[PDB]
Symmetry: C2
Subunit: 340 residues, 2 copies
Amino acid sequence: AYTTFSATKNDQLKEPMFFGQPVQVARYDQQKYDIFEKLIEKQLSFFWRPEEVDVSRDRIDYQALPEHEKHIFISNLKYQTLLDSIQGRSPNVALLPLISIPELETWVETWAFSETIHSRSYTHIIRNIVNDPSVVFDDIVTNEQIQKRAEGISSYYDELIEMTSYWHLLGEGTHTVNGKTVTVSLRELKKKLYLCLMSVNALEAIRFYVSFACSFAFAERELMEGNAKIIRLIARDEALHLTGTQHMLNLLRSGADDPEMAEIAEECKQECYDLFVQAAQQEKDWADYLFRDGSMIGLNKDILCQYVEYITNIRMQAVGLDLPFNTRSNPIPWINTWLV
Amino acid sequence: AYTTFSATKNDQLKEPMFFGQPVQVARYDQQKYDIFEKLIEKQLSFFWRPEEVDVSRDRIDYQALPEHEKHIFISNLKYQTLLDSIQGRSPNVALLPLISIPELETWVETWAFSETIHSRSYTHIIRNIVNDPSVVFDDIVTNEQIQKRAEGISSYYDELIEMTSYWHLLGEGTHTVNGKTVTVSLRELKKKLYLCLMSVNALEAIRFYVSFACSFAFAERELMEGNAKIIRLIARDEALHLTGTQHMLNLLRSGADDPEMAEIAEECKQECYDLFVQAAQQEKDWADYLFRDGSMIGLNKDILCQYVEYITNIRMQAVGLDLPFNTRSNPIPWINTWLV
């Protein structure tokens, strides 16, 4: 049962965020949750074009970099490119078929679109600082180490899309498909979407911010100012994207939306905690590849592991989970100048 | 078998537009078909927000209109709202899991996104001209003369989405699902894509143009000018979208992108021909509903039907079909003032 235009005249204020009737009329005169409408308007105010930022001094700054700082810069760029390539298409393929209220259907499409813009700014940077872009791009797919700190991100989205396809086609029940017993359960798909949403929150609120801090390290040295203007604009969109998932998650938790989602939130709490612990440790392991050829004066593995700890405690707090790391002050308060 | 980051390193310049390996890295330095990167760029420089078009005067223009004209105006606006409600979501949920080159993936998302902006301008007009938005918006879902068409459009996308899930889940073959035999054939899924794309080409290239003619008739009499400035901007976007589907269709039937789409476009030639005559006749009929209580100045059912015949011949001709109607000069040359 998915349809692009459902023929039941319904009250779109009484639907859940997810799993109710597919949206048919897109109206903005009213909304169940104003925050998603606020976010769409704010994102639309931030419209920027990468191509209009000057990155010409960066080819000079980059070639003047020692090989090992050149490696730190490019591995960090590569991982940013991977993440927003996944973020450009995935909100639209994984969540959009499950949404039931229009402000959130348009928010998810606006958010996915702002990530296609970020992907365009990584082509803008790479093609100006490096001579054959294809050696950077091809290496993103094949690099054992980039796939390693990213382990689990596409997996999860792909598990959700498969389960949604099963539910849309067969409906709830225990079924026989090519002599295999397949059970489709809506409670389970709801657990799957809830955990998908906690992981999207960890990827935008932690993993992108650790990368941002590696980018602005150079801007503190007065290097790579074009790259830095772009990343500041990417950070500004990223704050909206994170506010979005934090509000979806906390509204699901309150029990004001779908009552089954509030029970799942409480029932899934340990899995939520563990995935943020998982994402933190993946970010800390990456440092071993990033500082492989030696580190930089303001950026080494001890600094990085300390900001990963710092930022995870903040992020887990904002969505009401127990803090895993011992409380500490911001290791790199210069990031404050450049951010969000 | 759908994935959000295919781990196979692959040369994206050699992938077909559809049904090859999912796109993993989103890059814009090179492209197999330059035309989709040229459309992303025109669509980003065409960016506008409906909030800064003042529509306030249109409230009086509309109250002053004779009831039959209020009816032609609001019925036309309702149909436009129905079509971009389907067009914000549907490019994304239906085409995006089938695309295998990056520049076409980002065009589909940019395209979907410019449609949510169109949806938002319609709430912007409605809010300022009738002030109980709900009597317009709920009547979109139930209205018999409108519902007529929605059903046809949603059908194409809904069967392609249902078939695509079967292919992604089970692959080609004869499968059994709870006692039934289900045959999944990629040849048949390619047919569904072709005719779905053909129907969207009619949607943006004909159905939307017939509706622009009714909006601009008010603008010719210096009525509904807020609305007319907005439809101008929407019409400018429509021109890009139509260029999108015309290029994809002609690249498919030329055999250049997939030899087998050339075969299918030839077997599906008479079905495509009827598809278009049916869209045209559905538009001709709609005019009878509009002009039931009497016509207005500059437009009447004869004029409008003539305009439908003319726009349908220009569009069929552009996708290599034979013309069904008597060759004609444009019946309302004044509309070129408002169009591209």
